Write a protein that binds this ligand. Structure first.
Ligand SMILES: C[C@@H]1O[C@@H](Oc2c(-c3cc(O)c(O)c(O)c3)oc3cc(O)cc(O)c3c2=O)[C@H](O[C@@H]2O[C@H](COC(=O)/C=C/c3ccc(O)c(O)c3)[C@@H](O)[C@H](O)[C@H]2O)[C@H](O)[C@H]1O
Ligand SMILES: [Ca+2]
Ligand SMILES: [Cl-]
Length: 496
């Protein structure tokens, strides 16, 4: 469960949040494959509640109605088309699996659902599965409200309703089997693995029992006996009784400390400085590298109400965000996920964004296509961070340096730092309030290298900065503190 099952040489996934299946399929072919992306995390592909107050929020997709592959992203045909087309160009699909719960207990009964299936939350009736009252934790939960009240009680966190979401009885073989049926449908279509949503709210042993029922990956694309990559969403910032290590038997875990701390560091908040990043990884109290799924922001915390609070960096903070993503992609710790977002009309009132519910760009609820602009950016309010040169080129950097050791660290005791990855790549940051101008040991072979942050190698030309590495491995770097992108990265495949 620990291996991503990406094609050899591909080392990241991108969350194409709320994208339509047809747009992901095209994106695999026209961009993700040639630019070396390992795979895509898709939004939940199973039928959910169509919530109209507020108007089609992103979070409706976290309230299942059935396991039909029928959503605002597309239908089953379109989902299958996408997985096939992506696998056929060596780009994998990872499904966001919403398996802790069905929908909110107070949602009105009817057919307000993305495939029109009937459901009745009040009577616990989801006939498109089918589930009934016997399949939920009403009896097992011990709180007065039936909802989770106290995260200091690890039992109620698992057995009671997360903000009123009907909590599936995951100890039951019937329920485990219906979930496995859904997941095996997806595996056989060709998915490479799963994000397990709300894993903190499930017992590690119930997750185990579900995973036990799963097929090996599709043998047209994956070697025999391949197992789905599993990354469990466990939000563990320390201090709580539930620890993400309790989930290591089942797969990797999301390391939410990663972006919270990195954001604080890059913002230079709480006395933090980039020079402290020398021992980044387990030294900062994180999970072992081989069990981490890391990221700067995710779809929830980029809205500010999330794990990491105000320190989280997002596309709204573009300049610092690129630096944080670049550091993450250069550093060997963890398996990296890049976010790809849409814009929405933020409106703050006492620090809270009252529009943080807004769903993807849409025409009266129909999701808008991702358009590609002549400069390779996206239109229709899709942010397409994964297309920003500085991020896409660092996804490639990570591929190029795969397996190479963290080495040749430099710091100035403040916020000017640099490091290499064996003899294959080197990166330099200036986050201080004065310029960086210094000759550093890069560990790289002599030559002229294109800086892949400011530009690209095209044939035998660079379109941005050139760095000149001498016979002894040393090169000069100049970075103004006022620089648009105050970091430089070079690697074996950017050498002229
Ligand atoms: C910070 C917390 O955020 C929200 O908790 C959620 C969280 C959550 C769960 C946690 O254990 C946790 O530590 C955390 O910070 C957030 O997980 C969800 C998973 C789902 O599949 C579906 C969901 O609806 C949630 C969810 O709601 C809850 O807030 C509710 O969010 C509602 C909107 O839904 C979300 O914000 C969904 C967030 C989400 C959705 C999917 C995720 O994987 C995820 O990590 C988070 C609002 O309408 C309500 O007004 C508000 O009460 C909770 O009360 C609040 O304390
Ligand atoms: Ca639960
Ligand atoms: Cl996540």
């Amino acid at each position: 469960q620990y291996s991503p099952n990406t094609q050899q040489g591909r080392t990241s996934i991108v969350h194409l949040f709320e994208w339509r299946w047809v747009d992901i399929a095209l994106e695999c072919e026209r961009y993700l494959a040639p630019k070396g992306f390992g795979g895509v995390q898709v939004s939940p592909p199973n039928e959910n509640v169509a919530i109209y107050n507020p108007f089609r929020p992103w979070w409706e997709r976290y309230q299942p109605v059935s396991y039909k592959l029928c959503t605002r992203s597309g239908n089953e045909d379109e989902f299958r088309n996408m997985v096939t087309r992506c696998n056929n160009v060596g780009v994998r699909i990872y499904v966001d699996a919403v398996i802790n719960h069905m929908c909110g207990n107070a949602v009105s009964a009817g057919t307000s659902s993305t495939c029109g299936s009937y459901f009745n939350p009040g009577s616990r009736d989801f006939p498109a599965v089918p589930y009934s009252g016997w399949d939920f934790n009403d009896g097992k939960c011990k709180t007065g409200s039936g909802d989770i009240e106290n995260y200091n009680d690890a039992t109620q966190v698992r057995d009671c309703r997360l903000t009123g979401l009907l909590d599936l009885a995951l100890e039951k073989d019937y329920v485990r089997s219906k979930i496995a049926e859904y997941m095996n449908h997806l595996i056989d279509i060709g998915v490479a693995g799963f994000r397990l949503d709300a894993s903190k709210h499930m017992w590690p042993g119930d997750i185990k029992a579900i995973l036990d029922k799963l097929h090996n990956l599709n043998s047209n694309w994956f070697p025999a006996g391949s197992k789905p990559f599993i990354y469990q969403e466990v939000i563990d910032l320390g201090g709580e009784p539930i620890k993400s290590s309790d989930y290591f038997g089942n797969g990797r875990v999301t390391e939410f400390k990663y972006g919270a701390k990195l954001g604080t560091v890059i913002r230079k908040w709480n006395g933090e400085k980039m020079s402290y990043l020398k021992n980044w990884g387990e030294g900062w109290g994180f999970v072992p590298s081989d069990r981490a799924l890391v990221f700067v922001d995710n779809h929830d915390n980029q809205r500010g109400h999330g794990a990491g609070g105000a320190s989280i960096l997002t596309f709204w903070d573009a300049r610092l965000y690129k630096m944080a993503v670049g550091f993450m992609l250069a550093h060997p710790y963890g398996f990296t996920r890049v976010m790809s977002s849409y814009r929405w009309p933020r409106q703050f009132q006492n620090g809270n964004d009252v529009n943080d519910w807004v769903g993807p760009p849409n025409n009266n609820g129909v999701i808008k296509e991702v358009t590609i602009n002549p400069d390779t950016t996206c239109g229709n309010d899709w942010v397409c961070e994964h297309r920003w040169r500085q991020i896409r080129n660092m996804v490639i950097f990570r591929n190029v340096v795969d397996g190479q050791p963290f080495t040749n660290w430099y710091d100035n005791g403040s916020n000017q730092v640099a490091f290499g990855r064996g003899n294959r790549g080197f990166i330099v940051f200036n986050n201080d309030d004065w310029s960086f101008s210094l000759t550093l040991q890069t560990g790289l072979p002599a030559g002229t290298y294109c800086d892949v942050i400011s530009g690209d190698k095209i044939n035998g030309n660079c379109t941005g900065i050139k760095i000149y590495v001498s016979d002894d491995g040393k090169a000069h770097f100049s970075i103004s503190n006022s620089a648009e992108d105050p970091f430089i990265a070079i690697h074996a495949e950017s050498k002229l």
